[PDB]
Every structure is written in C-alpha cells, then in structure tokens.
Amino acid sequence: HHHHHHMVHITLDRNTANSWLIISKDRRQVRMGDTHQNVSDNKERFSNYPMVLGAQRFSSGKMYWEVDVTQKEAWDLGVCRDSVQRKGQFSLSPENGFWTIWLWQDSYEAGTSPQTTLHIQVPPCQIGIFVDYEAGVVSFYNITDHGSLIYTFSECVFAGPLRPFFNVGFNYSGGNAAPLKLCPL
Numbered sequence: 001h002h003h004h005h006h007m008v009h010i011t012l013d014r015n016t017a018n019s020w021l022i023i024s025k026d027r028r029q030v031r032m033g034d035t036h037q038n039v040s041d042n043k044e045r046f047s048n049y050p051m052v053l054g055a056q057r058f059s060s061g062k063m064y065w066e067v068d069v070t071q072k073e074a075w076d077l078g079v080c081r082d083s084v085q086r087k088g089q090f091s092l093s094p095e096n097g098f099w100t101i102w103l104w105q106d107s108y109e110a111g112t113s114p115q116t117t118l119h120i121q122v123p124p125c126q127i128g129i130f131v132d133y134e135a136g137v138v139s140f141y142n143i144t145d146h147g148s149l150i151y152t153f154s155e156c157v158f159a160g161p162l163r164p165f166f167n168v169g170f171n172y173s174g175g176n177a178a179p180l181k182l183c184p185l
C-alpha cells in the first residue's frame with residue numbers, strides 16, 4: 001500500500017483505560033496488569049474488557065498508524081465512535097460503533113455482525129490501520145507480509161468523531177501478557 005504518508009502520532013488516553021491496564025510513560029504502550037492498577041473509577045473506563053482508546057479524535061481526512069502485536073494470543077484493533085458504550089457487555093460491530101479485527105484461538109476475524117473469517121498466511125507481528133473519513137473506509141494491512149491487505153470495511157457510517165481502539169485481551173492462559181505498542185513513524 002501507499003498510505004504511509006498519512007501517518008499520525010497516536011497516544012493512549014489513560015482516563016478511558018480499564019482499571020487493570022498499565023500504560024507506559026510515553027503513552028505509546030499498554031499491557032494487562034495482574035491486578036487493579038489503583039486508579040479511581042469514572043464513566044469513560046471500559047469496565048468489562050481490557051480496552052483503551054487513543055486520545056486523538058478524527059472527523060475528516062486520511063489517517064494511518066501501526067501497532068505491534070508480537071507474541072500475543074488475543075487482541076482487538078481498529079477504530080470506534082467517540083460515544084461507544086463503556087459499561088457492561090457488548091459485541092464489536094459497526095452497529096455498536098466499532099470497525100475492528102481480532103485474533104482469538106489461533107484465527108483472525110473481522111468484527112462484522114456476524115464476524116467474518118480472515119485469510120492470513122503470514123501471522124502478523126505489526127498491523128497497519130488506514131481510515132479515510134470522507135470515503136467511509138477502514139482498512140487493515142499485514143506489515144510483516146510486505147503490507148498485504150487483511151480487510152476493508154467500506155460504506156462505513158461513522159456517525160460521529162472516531163478514536164483509535166485497542167483491546168490487549170485477557171491473560172487466562174499465561175501466554176498473552178505481551179503489550180500492544182504503537183510503532184514509530
């Protein structure tokens with residue numbers, strides 16, 4: 001792909017984080033802690049899942065960023081509306097304001113309703129995410145496989161400002177402790 005010149009510097013918003021997440025000083029990495037991280041509760045925090053938002057809000061233009069997923073067993077990545085539900089149980093779908101892909105149990109899937117099987121021959125260590133606000137497009141790229149396309153959501157109805165979206169996943173297995181990292185430009 002040729003989207004690299006739309007690169008944006010994403011940072012994580014501590015206030016939106018599930019209370020078990022540990023965000024690095026530079027706000028560029030996040031991992032699951034083994035306990036509550038001693039923060040107060042607030043209406044922005046995702047309560048049920050290990051999720052956090054980027055601080056940046058997008059309402060126009062073309063944006064690109066990259067995320068490192070090395071050695072993780074489970075994660076979700078993409079964008080979401082600023083006004084997505086934070087509390088309780090919900091599914092990741094465009095109807096609920098999410099445009100995402102994930103890894104779960106050795107398979108990759110796009111967060112459509114119902115979910116769509118992805119076809120990835122080279123398991124990615126870094127994911128590229130491209131948003132074209134005006135066109136209504138969110139695309140995902142396999143940086144480990146020379147930028148090959150993973151999935152395109154088209155005809156997106158964003159219906160609000162967008163934020164970068166992250167889920168580090170649970171670590172019930174002891175094999176999913178590794179962080180998500182925002183990769184340098």
Ligand SMILES: CC(C)C(=O)Nc1cccc(C(N)=O)c1
Pocket residue numbers: 041042043087
């Ligand atoms: C920051 C203060 C003013 C607040 O709102 N707290 C709070 C904490 C947990 C749940 C809720 C809630 N869901 O009402 C509200």
